[PDB]
Scaffold this active site. Structure first.
Site: not given
Ligand code: HEM
Ligand SMILES: N=C(NCCC[C@H](N)C(=O)N[C@@H](CCN)C(N)=O)N[N+](=O)[O-]
Ligand code: HEM
Ligand SMILES: N=C(NCCC[C@H](N)C(=O)N[C@@H](CCN)C(N)=O)N[N+](=O)[O-]
Ligand SMILES: C[C@H](O)[C@H](O)[C@H]1CNc2nc(N)[nH]c(=O)c2N1
Ligand SMILES: C[C@H](O)[C@H](O)[C@H]1CNc2nc(N)[nH]c(=O)c2N1
Ligand SMILES: C[As](C)(=O)[O-]
Ligand SMILES: C[As](C)(=O)[O-]
Ligand SMILES: [Zn+2]
Lengths: 405, 405
Positions: B109, B112, B281, B286
């Protein structure tokens, strides 16, 4: 056991069985992955002998004469020399096979589909820095070939117990000087400030431009390095212009045609060649993205963006992305116009995917460093981004070594 | 030097050592023999107790009462509860702490920097699929906040021995349907063909568009999943247009405002929350790069390039790179015009570098997956490309889990 490897774009799966042949450890452990780190943090007769035997076995297998009479006698020859002297010497044919295998095994090289075509120059009969210079000039002339680049490697004398190494101090045979100035700014290439200063310290009269070709600092065993200036006519350069942006050519940028790494060590059958410069041809992003756009390199992004009249006030206008694409396009256009070999990142990654398939059939896998194989711009627009990779060390290999100073 | 991984930033020349990795209690996929860092997907009361004690220790450390009478009493309460029931339950404050730490610990992520600002909605009293839907609609309303997005997570009841799990079958709360066509193609999102078919098999009457919002399939313990259609008024979407290419709007593209992952498992102190959807958000790449440009997703590169009249017949024209940048710009511009929160990759990566520095001071490191943190376009144009990273598993954590079907 064997790692499962998936391509997420196509859904295809393979299993890497080649990694079982790795006898050298990397930096990762089950506790933490250090895959994104750039650099890592006489020899035992038994160890050297085991490495030699493995290599000779590799060689005879490659010529389909494994277990042959020639194979057995060669193994005994190596055994005999190591037992009596603590080391041994490769036959030229073995050296050629070895250099190609080291390239084939390099995890960070996206150009490996070309591995079988490598001109190997045997320079192991070199006894002075002056002789090294002659070999280097001939390498450059052959490799450049007036723009029709040909892959080559020149191998200088192997390292020997209790004796200094043959070394090329420069990181590449052709590089631009970096001159530190008053306030701390740099004219030229910031990456080369240290080598530039060493050249000056060793008697070089510096120029004062942004693209001055550095002289070579060559070192024979236990002697101070000697300075040699490359004849300008041997160093082919490409002036950079843009296909539609008429003003780009006025930026006065240029780059050299030949990429020739000269600071790596070639290891074959336990023997180490501390000076073995190799060259192929450039992938456009090396120049267009890293050399010209890295903030710690020529850092021309802003200048170009302003010329394009982009809004550099905020990141959301994506001016950096737009400028970067045009600079890479200029590099491709310029090399094509100058008729100098170059490969764009799409073409290069497509050929690498073909290489992966070839190696899966040939050896059951291919060591690859994902962070280095995926290009610096447009990563996911290339097929390699969606391809899982397994990274490991196979020998023969090219490896980093300490700087000679 | 220090007996911990040395981490360097090559743009700045700065060095740090990661000491936080010493706190990892779960092994990753790498070994000294080979790195598998690029792979996407690589109870005993005694085991549960150890994990619970570690978590309670983490909680009391966070409130600065480690070793206190209350800390010791809580540890005994957990041991007694596990002793007579085989499991235990978290206090409200412990759940909040745990969910925030799981986000903080997520190596993949890039957002963070916002970890301390997570609204934790406790839904551990949920007892039916209908109530799950109510909680989900409330999450969506709160999180969307008419475009001014707020990070949130809703936690449903934890897994319990012998009893079925609470599960949300959809991968995200909002996703577009993918309909397999006669000719074998897909209308809509190719990535959601399976869930789409399951919705149809469970009674959903499908649409026939490229951007049809899917209904939710919610599963309460030991019951077949139930189908729920999201009220259109609650799903905020953004029509896509370009700031200078007036014809872009005509493509009829659009995307939803709320990214809300719903298929990951939240693990806290050995307890497993199989249903705990979270949302923040979007980072623009993405949508603009992966969702719209991946070959196996909407795959619109050629369509846009043709409208831009680019040369799609040769790789060296960099048509893919040019079209991708404009598509990403359209996404940013469109969300900004609609007043919907979104962050560009330059702004996001800069904020992540700040997060890394904050965590170096707060915890001695930050686990991070380089391949996932570096954006899919313009990688080296961002600061994270030049930053070495250490990847490891810390708990509390978000983990992948098998699909419920
Ligand atoms: C506040 C704005 C946030 C932004 C801009 C953000 C952005 C991102 C991005 C760009 C990814 C990669 C997604 C992908 O390529 O599939 C990601 C992954 C992830 N985010 Fe964040 N995130 C945010 C909030 C959160 C929140 C609120 C949580 C959890 C409480 C979180 C948990 C995670 C986790 C666990 C992953 C890994 C997901 C996976 O392995 O498929 N994120 N996030
Ligand atoms: N920005 C976020 N990105 C994660 C969710 C969108 C991401 N591009 C996505 O398509 N994730 C697949 C993850 C597949 N392993 C899904 N959950 O459908 N999450 N967020 O809470 O702010
Ligand atoms: C034929 C054209 C070739 C192409 C297009 C090619 C392309 C590349 C690229 C793009 C890199 C990464 C460079 C960087 O980012 O610093 C690289 C690395 C490397 N290449 Fe190739 N290469 C070619 C020929 C060769 C040859 C002839 C050899 C050796 C016989 C070779 C050995 C290596 C090694 C050892 C590395 C890693 C160097 C390092 O760690 O700094 N390559 N190559
Ligand atoms: N295309 C090549 N690229 C590798 C050499 C150029 C690379 N962009 C570079 O600047 N390498 C640094 C890496 C120093 N560790 C050098 N050797 O000066 N090599 N080739 O043989 O075709
Ligand atoms: C920190 C990170 O490993 C570093 O910036 C790497 C990433 N990928 C790279 N890839 C290539 N081809 N060349 C490089 O110099 C790098 N640098
Ligand atoms: C094979 C490779 O690991 C895979 O394509 C990864 C690379 N980096 C990524 N990075 C992010 N943020 N999201 C992804 O889905 C991926 N996919
Ligand atoms: C060349 As300037 C705009
Ligand atoms: C918009 As079409 C060309
Ligand atoms: Zn690793």
């Amino acid at each position: 056991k064997f790692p499962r490897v998936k391509n997420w774009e196509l859904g295809s799966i393979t299993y890497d069985t080649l990694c079982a042949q790795s006898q050298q450890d990397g930096p990762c452990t089950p506790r933490r992955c250090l895959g994104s780190l750039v650099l890592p943090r006489p020899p035992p007769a038994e160890q050297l002998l085991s490495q030699a035997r493995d290599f000779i076995n590799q060689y005879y297998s490659s010529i389909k004469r494994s277990g042959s009479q020639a194979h057995e006698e060669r193994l005994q020859e190596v055994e005999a020399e190591v037992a009596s002297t603590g080391t041994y010497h490769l036959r030229e044919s073995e050296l050629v096979f070895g250099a190609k295998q080291a390239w084939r095994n390099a995890p960070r090289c996206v150009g490996r589909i070309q591995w079988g075509k490598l001109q190997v120059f045997d320079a192991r009969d070199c006894s002075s820095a002056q002789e090294m210079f002659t070999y280097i000039c001939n390498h450059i002339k052959y490799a450049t070939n007036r723009g029709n680049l040909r892959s080559a490697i020149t191998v200088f004398p192997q390292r020997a117990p209790g004796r200094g190494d043959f070394r090329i101090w420069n990181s590449q045979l052709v590089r631009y000087a970096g001159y530190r100035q008053q306030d701390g700014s740099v004219r030229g290439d910031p990456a080369n400030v240290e080598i530039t200063e060493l050249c000056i310290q060793h008697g070089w009269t510096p120029g004062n431009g942004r693209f001055d070709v550095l002289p070579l600092l060559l070192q024979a065993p236990d002697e101070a390095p000697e300075l040699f200036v490359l004849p300008p006519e041997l160093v082919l350069e490409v002036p950079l212009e843009h296909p539609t942006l008429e003003w780009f050519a006025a930026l006065g940028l240029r780059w050299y045609a030949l990429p020739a790494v000269s600071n790596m060590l070639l290891e074959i059958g336990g023997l180490e060649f501390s000076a073995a410069p190799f060259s192929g041809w450039y992938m456009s992003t090396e120049i267009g993205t890293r050399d010209l756009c890295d903030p710690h390199r020529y850092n021309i992004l802003e200048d170009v963006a302003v010329c394009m009249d982009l809004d550099t006030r905020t990141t959301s206008s994506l001016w950096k992305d737009k400028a970067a694409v045009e600079i890479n396009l200029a590099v491709l256009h310029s090399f094509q116009l100058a008729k100098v070999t170059i490969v764009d990142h799409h073409a290069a990654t497509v050929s690498f995917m073909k290489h992966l398939d070839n190696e899966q059939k040939a050896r059951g896998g291919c060591p690859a460093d994902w962070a280095w194989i995926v290009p610096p711009i447009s990563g996911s627009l290339t097929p390699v981004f969606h391809q899982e990779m397994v990274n490991y060390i196979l020998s023969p290999a090219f490896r980093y070594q300490p700087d000679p100073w």
